Design a protein around this motif. Sequence first.
Motif, short mmCIF file in Angstrom:
data_model
loop_
_atom_site.label_atom_id
_atom_site.label_comp_id
_atom_site.label_asym_id
_atom_site.label_seq_id
_atom_site.Cartn_x
_atom_site.Cartn_y
_atom_site.Cartn_z
N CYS A 51 -9.12 5.34 7.45
CA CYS A 51 -10.46 5.37 6.51
C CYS A 51 -11.66 5.33 7.64
O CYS A 51 -11.81 4.49 8.29
CB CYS A 51 -10.31 3.81 6.27
SG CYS A 51 -8.84 3.48 4.83
N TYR A 67 0.89 -1.15 0.27
CA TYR A 67 0.03 -0.03 -0.19
C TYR A 67 1.01 1.26 0.11
O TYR A 67 0.65 2.19 -0.59
CB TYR A 67 -0.82 -0.04 1.16
CG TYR A 67 -1.72 -1.31 1.48
CD1 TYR A 67 -2.71 -1.70 0.48
CD2 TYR A 67 -1.29 -2.30 2.42
CE1 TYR A 67 -3.22 -2.83 0.69
CE2 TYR A 67 -1.80 -3.57 2.44
CZ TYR A 67 -3.00 -3.78 1.65
OH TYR A 67 -3.54 -5.04 1.68
N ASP A 77 -17.56 0.81 1.51
CA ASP A 77 -16.22 1.27 1.41
C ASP A 77 -15.80 2.18 2.48
O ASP A 77 -16.78 2.74 3.13
CB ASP A 77 -16.34 2.10 0.06
CG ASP A 77 -16.80 1.07 -1.24
OD1 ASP A 77 -17.79 0.77 -1.38
OD2 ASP A 77 -15.76 0.85 -1.70
N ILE A 116 -12.68 3.25 -2.15
CA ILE A 116 -12.15 2.02 -2.22
C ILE A 116 -12.95 1.15 -1.07
O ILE A 116 -13.51 1.52 -0.09
CB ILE A 116 -10.57 1.92 -2.12
CG1 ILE A 116 -10.37 2.64 -0.75
CG2 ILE A 116 -9.95 2.29 -3.19
CD1 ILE A 116 -8.96 3.55 -0.88
N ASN A 117 -12.74 -0.33 -1.38
CA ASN A 117 -13.33 -1.23 -0.57
C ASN A 117 -12.57 -1.43 0.80
O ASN A 117 -11.34 -1.00 0.95
CB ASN A 117 -13.18 -2.58 -1.30
CG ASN A 117 -14.27 -3.42 -0.69
OD1 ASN A 117 -14.84 -3.08 -0.11
ND2 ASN A 117 -14.00 -4.75 -1.23
N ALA A 152 -11.97 -3.86 2.04
CA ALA A 152 -10.51 -4.99 2.05
C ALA A 152 -9.50 -4.60 1.50
O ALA A 152 -8.49 -4.97 1.95
CB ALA A 152 -11.28 -6.26 1.30
N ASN A 153 -9.40 -3.68 0.54
CA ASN A 153 -8.53 -3.06 -0.04
C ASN A 153 -7.70 -2.26 1.02
O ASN A 153 -6.36 -2.08 0.60
CB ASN A 153 -9.07 -2.01 -1.15
CG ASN A 153 -9.94 -2.67 -2.25
OD1 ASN A 153 -10.24 -3.61 -2.27
ND2 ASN A 153 -10.91 -1.69 -2.80
N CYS A 154 -8.14 -2.12 2.27
CA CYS A 154 -7.27 -1.29 3.28
C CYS A 154 -7.19 -2.38 4.21
O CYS A 154 -8.18 -2.43 5.00
CB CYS A 154 -7.95 -0.09 3.56
SG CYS A 154 -8.52 1.21 2.27
N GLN A 155 -5.80 -2.90 4.31
CA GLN A 155 -5.68 -3.76 5.52
C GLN A 155 -4.72 -3.14 6.38
O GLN A 155 -3.64 -2.69 6.18
CB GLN A 155 -5.04 -4.98 4.89
CG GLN A 155 -5.71 -6.10 4.22
CD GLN A 155 -4.97 -7.11 3.69
OE1 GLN A 155 -4.68 -7.40 2.76
NE2 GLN A 155 -4.92 -8.29 4.68
N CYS A 171 -4.04 1.69 2.04
CA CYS A 171 -4.74 1.08 0.80
C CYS A 171 -4.00 1.27 -0.42
O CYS A 171 -2.91 1.95 -0.35
CB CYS A 171 -6.13 1.88 0.66
SG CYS A 171 -6.63 2.41 2.18
N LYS A 172 -4.31 0.71 -1.58
CA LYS A 172 -3.38 0.91 -2.81
C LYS A 172 -4.17 1.98 -3.70
O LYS A 172 -5.02 2.74 -3.19
CB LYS A 172 -3.54 -0.73 -3.49
CG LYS A 172 -4.87 -0.74 -4.17
CD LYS A 172 -5.77 -1.22 -3.05
CE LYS A 172 -7.06 -0.03 -3.41
NZ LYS A 172 -8.08 -0.85 -4.09
N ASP A 173 -3.63 2.03 -4.98
CA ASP A 173 -4.29 3.31 -6.04
C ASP A 173 -3.74 4.52 -5.47
O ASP A 173 -3.73 5.28 -6.12
CB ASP A 173 -5.63 3.07 -6.01
CG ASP A 173 -6.29 4.04 -6.96
OD1 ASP A 173 -6.34 3.50 -8.12
OD2 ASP A 173 -6.58 5.09 -6.68
#
Length: 88
Positions: free
Chosen positions: A24, A18, A33, A77-78, A80-83, A63-65
């Motif tokens: 978040c 990430y 999200d 974002i989702n 799950a996308n943020c761990q 998160c990514k992106d």
Amino acid sequence: SPAAMERQVPYTPCSGLYGTAQCCATDVLGVADLDCANPPATLANATHFESTCAAIGQRARCCKDDVTNTGNSFLIINAANCQTPAGL
């Protein structure tokens, strides 16, 4: 007293996967999200950005992106996308 005023411990939260730390904000009922916004500041440590998010009731995520985009600030974002970072 900060007798360590000359020593600064390096702390990096998430990298490669990430590489971008932020808070978040989860939803109420329509959860799916979380509004994660990049916090501009010098994260002194974990408890620092961990609380910076919990301030409003959030938590430190990653998160990514928000890497291949110089304008990495606010994203949709989702959850799950943020761990959550390991050891946090």
